Amino acid sequence: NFIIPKKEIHTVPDMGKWKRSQAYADYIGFILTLNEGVKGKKLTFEYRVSEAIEKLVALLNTLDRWIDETPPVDQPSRFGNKAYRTWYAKLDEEAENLVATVVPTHLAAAVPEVAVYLKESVGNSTRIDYGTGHEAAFAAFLCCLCKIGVLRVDDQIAIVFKVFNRYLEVMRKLQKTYRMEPAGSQGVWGLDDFQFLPFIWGSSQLIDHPYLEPRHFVDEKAVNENHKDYMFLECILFITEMKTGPFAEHSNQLWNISAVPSWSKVNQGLIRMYKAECLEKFPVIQHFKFGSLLPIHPVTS
Numbered sequence: 001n002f003i004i005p006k007k008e009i010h011t012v013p014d015m016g017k018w019k020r021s022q023a024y025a026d027y028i029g030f031i032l033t034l035n036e037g038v039k040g041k042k043l044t045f046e047y048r049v050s051e052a053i054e055k056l057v058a059l060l061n062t063l064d065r066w067i068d069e070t071p072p073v074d075q076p077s078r079f080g081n082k083a084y085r086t087w088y089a090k091l092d093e094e095a096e097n098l099v100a101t102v103v104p105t106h107l108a109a110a111v112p113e114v115a116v117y118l119k120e121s122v123g124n125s126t127r128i129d130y131g132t133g134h135e136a137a138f139a140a141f142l143c144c145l146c147k148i149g150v151l152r153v154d155d156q157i158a159i160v161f162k163v164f165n166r167y168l169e170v171m172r173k174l175q176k177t178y179r180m181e182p183a184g185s186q187g188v189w190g191l192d193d194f195q196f197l198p199f200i201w202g203s204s205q206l207i208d209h210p211y212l213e214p215r216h217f218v219d220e221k222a223v224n225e226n227h228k229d230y231m232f233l234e235c236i237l238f239i240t241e242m243k244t245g246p247f248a249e250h251s252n253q254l255w256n257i258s259a260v261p262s263w264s265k266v267n268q269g270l271i272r273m274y275k276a277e278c279l280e281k282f283p284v285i286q287h288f289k290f291g292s293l294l295p296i297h298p299v300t301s
């Protein structure tokens with residue numbers, strides 16, 4: 001019964017149907033299961049890589065190549081570069097064909113439904129911005145693939161370390177290349193100007209790390225020397241290379257979070273925060289789309 005996912009959160013009370021939905025249960029369960037799976041593991045951990053995973057990475061690589069083939073254009077506006085729209089148009093048109101390389105031929109009926117999440121995961125073509133809402137769309141895309149059997153429990157680490165990790169690299173390229181802006185006012189009140197999940201999964205990786213403590217993520221040397229093994233630090237590296245000045249000024253929430261004593265507390269706290277700043281934040285999550293795979297109907301077992 002695959003169907004094109006559509007918006008269901010129109011009023012504030014709908015935040016309640018969302019919270020009670022199968023979609024919410026499956027989504028948070030997905031986020032938390034992966035969180036558990038990557039706990040205490042470096043990005044170079046030896047996890048199994050399935051054909052679907054390689055196809056997902058290939059999909060992201062195509063996206064990446066398209067960025068290279070679509071250079072920023074000179075323009076008067078000093079915000080998002082309009083070439084982003086040229087790049088996005090490619091994804092918008094080819095989304096299903098791309099997803100078809102990942103989903104098996106006999107489950108082609110699921111491709112249009114799944115592809116919607118992919119189209120909603122790389123930013124907004126109107127303002128040329130990106131926020132946690134788009135990131136959540138990518139997580140939903142992945143969650144849908146699990147529900148139809150493309151990704152299994154055995155792929156949980158790869159989903160974060162390989163697929164989501166590659167996705168973040170492409171997003172950073174998009175953000176830098178097209179001078180994208182943070183969605184809404186996320187640049188002010190959000191944990192980070194663009195992402196959130198990597199901070200959750202990334203902090204999970206670092207739980208009980210023998211040396212690295214949250215205070216080290218604002219330590220440039222620690223970041224510079226370990227980012228390739230830890231998603232959380234890679235995010236910080238992106239911040240340091242793009243921004244100038246003290247974290248207290250340009251990344252206040254993260255500056256404050258660095259004062260939290262343990263990665264365990266960072267992870268638990270970020271999960272709560274994620275639900276508060278993203279999943280329970282009407283302005284952000286209202287654009288979530290619901291279909292058959294992530295349905296709005298109350299959760300059942």
Ligand SMILES: [Mg+2]
Nearest residue numbers: 187188192193
């Ligand atoms: Mg900010």
